[model samples]
Every structure is written in structure tokens, then in C-alpha cells.
Target: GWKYFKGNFYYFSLIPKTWYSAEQFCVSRNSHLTSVTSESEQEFLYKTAGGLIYWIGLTKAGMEGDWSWVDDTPFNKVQSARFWIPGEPNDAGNNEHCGNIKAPSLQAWNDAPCDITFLFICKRPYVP
Candidate 1:
């Protein structure tokens, strides 16, 4: 079961997988890895994670130099910048191409290698 927050349903996977795999899992569940589109959504995500790191939908991947959300939520660089820890998305060693979130702090977003395994969150809009 997923946690219902606001107008969406969020599922925090306990199983670990790489970023791409995580997204696939979400897809199979009829949703997609969660995207941070607003301040409240960001807060809901990090706090929901509760200190564990989880792969998110944001990625630059092969598109390098351009970041986009896997779920296609509008990418707002100005608004998105607030969630990342300072000096991140640096694509350290030119290897990081995926985004992850760690809880207990608002600025918990970080860019990571796409191949690394981690738990992830899946999101879907609630429909009546």
C-alpha cells in the first residue's frame, strides 16, 4: 500500500535497485518515480523517506547538461535548486546521472550514479 498525501499516492519501496530499475518498478505499478514539482511535494517526499536514501525520477542521464524529470513534471530549475544540497548535481567524476533523496532535511536531493542500488519512491495522481 502507498501513503496518500494531498492529491497523490506515494509508494516508498523497501527493495533496493538501481535508478533505472527503480523507475521500471514504478512503471510496472502503473506509476512513475516521484518528481518534486512543488515545495510541499518536496517536503512530503523527504519526510516520508525518513532518513533512508531513495532514487528519484530526476535525471540527466545520456542527455547530459540537461536535467529532466522522468515523470515529465515541468522542470523548474529555479524552484528545483532549493532542494539540492549545495555544490551537488556536480556529476562528480562525470559519473552521476541520477537523483536521490535522503530524509530528515529539506535539502536532501543529490545526484548519483544511475547504476547504484537504492530504495525508491513511486508516485501517482489520485483519481476518484
Candidate 2:
């Protein structure tokens, strides 16, 4: 099984892959991309992420600037006032849309093209 557990919650992770791949991978296994709902959850990911960038549930959803989570919640309206970096999600060159937890900044949200390959995180209910 490609399942992982921490805090009694299920997680899935692996080597670098495109955001779309990550999306499909999670779905294939009955889960969604990681959605950092609280500071403590983000902290858990940051502290145990193996120091690599991770894809979250956030994305433009092909809206070309309207960032939203996998569940269709607006990014700007989300609970946390996260990093989003100074010059990031700028869609740099107007081509990026997917969101990620940047490792260097301790889990700041950064936008990248959907095709860009990076490590991803996913979560589901505890089976046991």
C-alpha cells in the first residue's frame, strides 16, 4: 500500500512528479492533495517533509489566476495568511498556477506550472 500515517492520519509521498501526476496519483488512491488547513498541520508537514518542495491541494484549476483549493475554496480567502512569497504566484511570465510548500522557506506557498515536477503530499482517513 502507498499509504503513510502520522498523527493517525494517512499520507502519501514520493519522488518528484508533475502536479497533475500528483493529483491523479492521490485520486487513484482515494485521496486529495494535501491541504494545509492549520498552522499545526503545516508545521507537521514542514518538520517531516524531508526538506523537499511539496504540492498541495491549491491550484488555479485552469482558471488562469483564480487560485483555489482542490475542494474549490478560494486561496486568498483561506484561513491562513501564508507566505505566497514576495514575487511568487505572480504566475511568473504568466504561466504558473499550481501551489506548493516551499522547503527553504519552511513551507511557504509557492505557485508553479502544473507541468512542473515536484514532490507531492496527499492525505486520507486512517484505515485502522
Candidate 3:
């Protein structure tokens, strides 16, 4: 139901859903929303998404300014900082707590309200 990239499988949703709903959908499929940890992975996902906005695994759901991946992947602040577009994660309207790829570029991440709907990507290790 998804594409294989390196050792992981990726799924891009055609329909939009809220961040929590999207992650739950991925979890039901045995994966979490994707966490882009490398340049190659980012590039792969960017192309795979066909330049459409999609939610990633990153979010600051419970804690303020404490961004973490849904799958518990370690958050690399310094390295991951480059993923955001200029002046983003501004928490505009004080409710932008979800992460989504908002642009066509590799550095397309943006913070939006978690309740807002958006297409999303999922990733899991290849079993075979």
C-alpha cells in the first residue's frame, strides 16, 4: 500500500485529515507519520509527495516548544532547525502546534493548528 525507500516504506495520503487523525491512520497501518532525519530522506519524501502539503511526524502536542516525533525519534534541534522555512513555528494565533510540509522545497516545514486538516505521510521499517 506504500512505496519502499531504502529500508523503510512510505505512504502518502491522498485525502486530508487532522494531525492526530492522520497519525492514527498511519498507526492503524503499522507505521507512524514520517520523521525526516536525513537530506536523502527529505528529498525522497519531497518528490514522493509530488510537491503537495503533508503532515510529518513532528509536533509539540503536549508541551510548549517541545517538538518531538510521534514515533519517539530523537529530535535534533540544531540539525533539524534547517528544515523549517524562515521565521516559521511562530505559533501564529497561539495554536500552531502541528508540523506540515507547507512548500514545494525540501525545507518546507511549517507549524499549523493541529486541528486543521492536511494530507500526511507515513513511514515504517520494511519487514522484508
lDDT of 3 by residue, 20-113 (tens): 9999999999999999898888888887777788999989845447888999998888888878888987899988888998777768889999
After superposition, the stretches of candidate 2 with alpha carbons farther than 4 Å from their true spots are 1-12, 61-64, 72-78, 104-107
Pitting candidate 1 against candidate 2, the one with the higher TM-score is 1
Cα RMSD to the true fold for all candidates: 1.4, 3.1, 1.3
- Candidate 1 lDDT at 14 equals 78
Model 1, range 63-114, lDDT digits (tens) per residue? Answer: 4467889998877888888889877878888888899996457788999889
CA lDDT for candidate 1 = 0.87
TM-score for each prediction? 0.94, 0.78, 0.93
Which ten-residue region of model 2 has the weakest summed lDDT?
1-10
In candidate 2 the C-alpha lDDT for residue 18 amounts to: 90
For each candidate in the order shown, give its overall lDDT on alpha carbons: 0.87, 0.71, 0.88
The predicted structure with the larger lDDT, 1 or 3, is 3
Off by over 4 Å in 1: 61-64
The alpha-carbon root-mean-square deviation between model 1 and the true structure, to one decimal in Å, is 1.4
Question: Largest lDDT belongs to which candidate?
Answer: 3
| Cα TM-score of candidate 2 | 0.78
Worst 10 residues of 1 by lDDT: 58-67
| Colliding residue pairs in candidate 2 | none
